[PDB]
From a paper:
Retinoschisin, an octameric retinal-specific protein, is essential for retinal architecture with mutations causing X-linked retinoschisis (XLRS), a monogenic form of macular degeneration. Retinoschisin, a 24kDa protein secreted by photoreceptors, consists of a retinoschisin (Rs1) domain and a discoidin domain with a small C-terminal extension. Uniquely, the cysteine rich Rs1 domain and the C-terminal extension in retinoschisin mediate the formation of a C59-C223 disulfide linkage which is essential for octamerisation. Retinoschisin forms a dimer of octamers with each octameric ring adopting a planar propeller structure.
Previously, the disease-causing R141H mutation was found to be secreted as an octamer at similar levels to wild-type retinoschisin. R141H also formed octamer and dimer of octamer species, with imaging under cryo-EM conditions confirming a similar double-stack arrangement to the wild-type. Moreover, the increased number of side views allowed for 3D reconstruction of the R141H complex at the higher resolution of 4.2Å. This revealed a comparable domain arrangement to the wild-type protein. A homology model of the R141H discoidin domain was constructed and fitted to the map using DockEM. As previously observed, the central density represented the flexible N-terminal Rs1 domains which were masked out in the refinement procedure. Comparison of the R141H hexadecamer structure to the wild-type retinoschisin map filtered at 5Å with DockEM, revealed a highly similar structure. Mapping of the R141H mutation indicated that it was located in a spike region distinct from intra- and inter-octamer interfaces with an overall positive charge. Comparison of the intrinsic fluorescence of wild-type and R141H mutant retinoschisin showed increased fluorescence in the mutant despite the lack of gross conformational change, suggesting a small change in the spike regions. The disulfide-linkage between spikes 3 and 2 (10) could act to propagate a conformational change in spike 3 to spike 2, generating a wider subtle reorganization of the spikes at the propeller tips.
Author numbering:
A (entry chain H), B (entry chain A), C (entry chain B), D (entry chain G), E (entry chain F), F (entry chain E), ...: 63 to 219
The structure:
Amino acid sequence: CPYHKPLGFESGEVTPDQITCSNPEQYVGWYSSWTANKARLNSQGFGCAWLSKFQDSSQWLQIDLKEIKVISGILTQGHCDIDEWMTKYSVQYRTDERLNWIYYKDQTGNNRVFYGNSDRTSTVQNLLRPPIISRFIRLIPLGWHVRIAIRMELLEC
Amino acid sequence: CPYHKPLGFESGEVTPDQITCSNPEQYVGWYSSWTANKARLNSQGFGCAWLSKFQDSSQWLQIDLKEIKVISGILTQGHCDIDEWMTKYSVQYRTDERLNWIYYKDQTGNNRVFYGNSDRTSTVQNLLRPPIISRFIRLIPLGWHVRIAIRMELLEC
Amino acid sequence: CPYHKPLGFESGEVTPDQITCSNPEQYVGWYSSWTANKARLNSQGFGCAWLSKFQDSSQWLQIDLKEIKVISGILTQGHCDIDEWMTKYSVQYRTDERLNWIYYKDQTGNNRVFYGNSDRTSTVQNLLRPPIISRFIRLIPLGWHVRIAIRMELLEC
Amino acid sequence: CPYHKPLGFESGEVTPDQITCSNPEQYVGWYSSWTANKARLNSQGFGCAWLSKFQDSSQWLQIDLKEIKVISGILTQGHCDIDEWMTKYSVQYRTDERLNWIYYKDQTGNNRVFYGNSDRTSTVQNLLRPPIISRFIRLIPLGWHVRIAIRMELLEC
Amino acid sequence: CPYHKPLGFESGEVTPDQITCSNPEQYVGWYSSWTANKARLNSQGFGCAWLSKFQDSSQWLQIDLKEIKVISGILTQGHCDIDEWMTKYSVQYRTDERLNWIYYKDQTGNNRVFYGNSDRTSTVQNLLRPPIISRFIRLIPLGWHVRIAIRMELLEC
Amino acid sequence: CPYHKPLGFESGEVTPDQITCSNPEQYVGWYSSWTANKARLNSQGFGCAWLSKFQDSSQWLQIDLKEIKVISGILTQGHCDIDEWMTKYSVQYRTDERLNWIYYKDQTGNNRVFYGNSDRTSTVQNLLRPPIISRFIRLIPLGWHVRIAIRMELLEC
Amino acid sequence: CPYHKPLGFESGEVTPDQITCSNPEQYVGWYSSWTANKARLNSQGFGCAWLSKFQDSSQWLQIDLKEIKVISGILTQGHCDIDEWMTKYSVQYRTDERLNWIYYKDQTGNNRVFYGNSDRTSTVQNLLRPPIISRFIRLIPLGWHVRIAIRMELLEC
Amino acid sequence: CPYHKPLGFESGEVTPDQITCSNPEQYVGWYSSWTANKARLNSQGFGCAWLSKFQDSSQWLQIDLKEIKVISGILTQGHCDIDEWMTKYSVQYRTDERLNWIYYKDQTGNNRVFYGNSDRTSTVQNLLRPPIISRFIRLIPLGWHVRIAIRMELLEC
Amino acid sequence: CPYHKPLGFESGEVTPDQITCSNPEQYVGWYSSWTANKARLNSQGFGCAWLSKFQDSSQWLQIDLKEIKVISGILTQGHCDIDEWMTKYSVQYRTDERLNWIYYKDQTGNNRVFYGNSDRTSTVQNLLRPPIISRFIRLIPLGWHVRIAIRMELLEC
Amino acid sequence: CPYHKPLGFESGEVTPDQITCSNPEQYVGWYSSWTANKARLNSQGFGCAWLSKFQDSSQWLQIDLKEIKVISGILTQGHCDIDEWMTKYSVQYRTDERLNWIYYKDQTGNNRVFYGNSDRTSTVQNLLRPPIISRFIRLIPLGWHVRIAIRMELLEC
Amino acid sequence: CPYHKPLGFESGEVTPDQITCSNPEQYVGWYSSWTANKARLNSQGFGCAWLSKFQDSSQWLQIDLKEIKVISGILTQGHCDIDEWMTKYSVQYRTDERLNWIYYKDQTGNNRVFYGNSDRTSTVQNLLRPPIISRFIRLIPLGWHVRIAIRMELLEC
Amino acid sequence: CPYHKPLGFESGEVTPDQITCSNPEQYVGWYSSWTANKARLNSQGFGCAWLSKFQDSSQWLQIDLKEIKVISGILTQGHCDIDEWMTKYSVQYRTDERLNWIYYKDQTGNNRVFYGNSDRTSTVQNLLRPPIISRFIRLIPLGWHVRIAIRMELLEC
Amino acid sequence: CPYHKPLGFESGEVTPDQITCSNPEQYVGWYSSWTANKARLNSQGFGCAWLSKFQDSSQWLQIDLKEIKVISGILTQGHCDIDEWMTKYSVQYRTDERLNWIYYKDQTGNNRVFYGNSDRTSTVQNLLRPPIISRFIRLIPLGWHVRIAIRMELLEC
């Protein structure tokens, strides 16, 4: 809800089982690989954000929350050193974990698509007034500058 | 109601008995044929949507819900590869399952008819503010481009 | 009331005793004759609507409801094949079934009369905001094009 | 909340364990050093405010409150004798004491940064209407005139 | 609060221990000296108001109330015979009696200072809408015409 | 309060002990003298109002009510035969009967003074919206035409 | 109160003791004389209204009601045959029956006086919004055309 | 233009060559037949208006004016004795006398059609604000009650 | 300009050299073929509109006017018998006859495209307020129902 | 000015001397190279737009107009096949051809930078209301997706 | 005036006699020294802006224009590499070249002072609506970060 | 008039005959004494403003302008080192040089008096919208802090 | 007219023949007596204003102007030492010098009378917007405090 109560990615206490991906870094497994080791809210180190090797168009990233909550809004950031940013994407939400739905608003009578940002210092937010009763959220970035890299930060009620 | 709580067609758990039609694909039966096998909310495969062979003007498609609910609004999509879209249609609603009524609004003092869409990327919605206490809903498309094909998605309260 | 809860004429379960008229088709009786056999909400067949032989000016049609309810609004349609429509009429309402009253509004400081429609596709409604606590309703059409024929559809609260 | 109920730094009863820093004045310890001895709300003496020797860009100052409260607003002052003031900074807030978050508002669709002040007599406040449910607050001053020196004063609900 | 319920200085029943000062008139003590003997709301006699010998810039005057109350507003007067008035001052408020805070408003984004008055007949009030939950109040007059002399009159809720 | 419930001076049942003055008519006493004998709300006789011999500037007139009430508003009249009216005055109110306070409003940022009237037929009222929780009320007329004479009439809630 | 619930003068059941006057018609008594015998709300007969012989300026007419009620408003009429009407008057109200008060409004900052009427057919009313908690009401007509004659009609809540 | 300056059909001075039709009454000619003999603005006689024998759908009636003028608005009437009125029609205008154009407005984003009237006493006008620079005007009535009969009356600027 | 002064296609006096196309009907030439023989504003006959054989996406149709004029607005129609309508198109304009420009509006901050119509009876106009100083105009229909067929009608100032 | 009168790049009549660049394609010269041969308003062929080999940050492109005119607004497009678009740029204008100025608006109290577009179909315009009296205009694109490619189109008054 | 017509410092054609200063770089003279050699609107080289050695508080810089013009507005920039910016200053204007006046606005009822900027990328302008008929303009910067350095740019009408 | 065109006191070219006073500094004369030698718009030196020895209440200072002009507005300043400011004064204006008039405004229905200032840095102006057609202007300061000292600056049209 | 152009009474150049009165001071004449010798706009001396011996109710004072002008507005003052002021008066104006008219406004639907003032310091003006084309003006003061004394000051256009 319209409040300042974001999630806790910088804490790191969350197990890597929730952050599921498909980018084996050292053929260790298939569940996770990058997890929250080098992709947190402002974390100094080698990897400032989550990088991507293969140019996968239908990219996804599971985000398992603690329970079902009303998510509204999401921050936007970039990547230091090598500037990287997205251009087009779409939010998703599910419940039974056996489908994939696209986020559509009421004031969009055309093929409008979310923007995002274009600078690491910019903080172009997207206030989602329509309450969304869901839990899992994913992003389908259709384009990017060089590589997908953004320090996401969902907002819970 | 004005919320984001659509049905679950992509799940596929619903039995094909609810999705009744009259288009025998391989003379298997008369109840259903295409069902939700190749007609869901974004499903990659051979059949991206529900096709139609015979040019049936008075087309219908039973949609049996779980129970009586207040339906308001409906999404609009197209078909990939071969672009297809409707032009005119009319929503229906019943209760005793022994009649067929047409959807008429209060701010329509003429022979106005719903539009729909004209592009797979477009998402021209139709916010139906007037609450409709019903369960079964059908569509009577009077025209089309080449063949009837649209990934419908009702909205429940 | 301002809602979408019309009556059920297409069902046909209602007995013909309620739909009383005075047009013996085959000298069978005097109570009813045409009833809801060829006059329902969109019913394919020979008689698309209720026809009239004699040019009766003071025409009436009893409509016995289930119980006393607040009626507000009424749909308007025409007749296929042979276009037919009314021009002037007046709504009535009673209680003790031993009188006949005319419908008069508050914002009518003259001899104004309801219109109706002039096309089978048109749906010129008449939103009657003033609540009317009654049960039986009749119409007194003073004119017509060739023959009285309209698929009425009262609205209950 | 929008009220006049600031903290109590001038009292001095608070122990130096809360005011943690990293500026050993006489190699006494590492926890605190300057504490509230020469940095209070208007305190006559040698040190009118908290000075800084090394030009540390990522400066921080722990402020442990009594309990979790809704902080909103903050005063701004300068330094006597030698005029000193900041130019850019960012408010932070945490809960589990194992992360660091940046303060972002809803009406900031760009890389906007808080100002502060530029005179010891000026009192340019920053009314933070959005409630912030937190406890620990820190500042990340990115620039200054000569040395970081400001008599801060948080506001609790 | 916005009401007409001022304190009772003209009564004189209050003991001189509350009105603390530092102006020995006849080296009698250090606690009080002038008290409410020649400084009340319109009191005919020798001393029409409270005079000041030494030109003390950081002047103070303790005002111990009965209990903690919401003070809002304060009257302004002058001195007869020899016209005297202030120019700049600042209201203060404390609780633990071990600090001194300055009064700052929300609609003051600069180094604004209260005015006061400039005539014994004038009654330029200062409606302080923001509730102030305090008890002890003092004034820090930075300037004056010849000598500090004003018949103050706090307003309690 | 804003109502029509004035006091009862014309009744005369009130004892003269309440109406205290200092104008011995026949050296009878010092408490009262004129009382409500020749000064009431429209009373035909010799003395149409309360006259004054000595030109006393700091004139007062005790008005002891039944109990503490919220007084708001006051009528204004003149004197027949010999026209007399005031020009400047000030309302007062007390509680402990051991002080004297002046009436000051919130919308008076100057040395404004009440007017009154200037004709026996005129009825220039002064609606005092700010509630005044008091009991005793007095007037300090600073000027007059020839002699102080006015048929006052307080208003109680 | 603003309603249509006038008194009952036309009934005549009220005893003549309430309608007190001072106009002996046949030296019968001093209490009443004309009473409601020839002065009611539209009463055909000899005396259409209440006449007056002597040109009494300070005219009065006691009107004893059943109990204390909130009176608001009063009708105005004339006299048939010989047209008669007033020009100036004043309403009065009392409680203890031992005084006489004049009716003064809040929006009258001058010597304004009520009008009344100037035609038997006219019905110039005077909506008295300010509630008046009283019982006895009288009129002090200061002028007239030839003789005082008006069919009054108080309004009770 | 918005003024009261209609044409002169009742005068009859205009020759029948302008009023061209195709309804030989007595096989006299082909140019005109009924002309303005029994079709004028209120003309008592046998033919109250212009009748029509054959049920011609694409009916036309040439109206040659004196010169090119700005026509705006048109009256609407009926027929006495036997009530007759139209239902749908369309205005036309040309210049070179070698084409036929239909009248379309700017605020008609659908298949709207002009109404007309439905009573000889009614005078439902159609204020055509958009100036129309033309001369010849015709009507294409698509429907009627029994026979086409209306006393038209163009309006010139 | 916002007026009713369309072109003259129904006249037919224009030579076929202006209406240039590339659809040889009987290998007669390459300049024109269909011209205004079976494509005019409502012309009864075999060809009700201009048909198209090959499914040419980048379709064009030269329209040489008399001189340079300010064109604003354009009508929209359909085709009888076999219903046909467009879906997407774009207006063009040139001057030197050696280029091709696309029509872009000021209130279109996206990839918006003109609609057109979807019924022969509908008249969905497109009021082009922005003046366009040009002469030649063409259309680039990107889609259609079955075949391109529309009775265009430009509007000149 | 706010009108539809763009330049003429598609004509090609302009000599290559005006379009100056610094990208020798075949070491032919230093003045121009790509010119308007493969970079015009929608020109089918090999090069759909102007490509760039070296990743030059301070890119420039001289645009010599016919004379000094008031330029306002500019279109935005993309590149087919390989999608390419800019992210940040700045407009410039000069007069004496011996300097370079940056375009700054009045409603930009920060480091705001123009956007542009992000799709070949999009037409995100930038209405520059402030008149700019200049002739030569250049762009300083600071970023891009892969290569600088955009079909610019200035707007003259 | 509110237009885009700045001066021409980047041209360099202006002689150094106009840009008078008092900072001998190599004891060459006293008139000028730095001039427009290393202080222009964006000029790549060693000196990006005008530096200052001595910490002169009452700094001045003569700016002789071509003639008397109405100056309104002024741009604000910073310095690359080493960030430098001002904090307080005051605009001046003269005519006879024998005095120095300070710039005071009408909506400044206090000791307000202009700000400027605090970033090389920021462009915080100061729209001076009040016309100023003058020629010579100077700045009196009272403070700075390290050294005075700003690429000024006056605006002429 | 509302413009920035003050007089020229800093120039000093004006002869001392215009600045007439009555404060012989060294018994040199009676016309002038201090003149514009140590009283100009910001002039560094011994006397920062015009001082006053004797406490003259009815102080005056002739200001002979070049000719009759419309004066509107006046600046307000203080004195450095020793802070001095006025409290009450009144503007005057004459024509025949044989009288003295006081400045009275239209929106002053009381004994209001101009304020001035109370700080050398403050610039509390007094916009005099009412045009004043005069030439000579003087001030009658009724009070001051210690000595009359203010750097006046009239404003001419 | 609404401007600052009063008459010139302080000059004294006007002859005493214009200021006609009827108060022989030393039986010198009958025309004038007090004239402008001791009654001017602020004139120090014995007589601060014009006194009156006999209590003349119908007082008059001729004021012969230079010519006919539009008079609007008039100042109001008092008398020093002995405070004196009026209460009621009426302005007059004539032309042929053979009559006397009273000043009546349009927004006075009652017996309203001008007030004036009640303090020498007050300046209660009376803006007379209605233009008055006259020359001679007089005042008819009906009341006063002790003696008629006021320093009048007419306002000419």
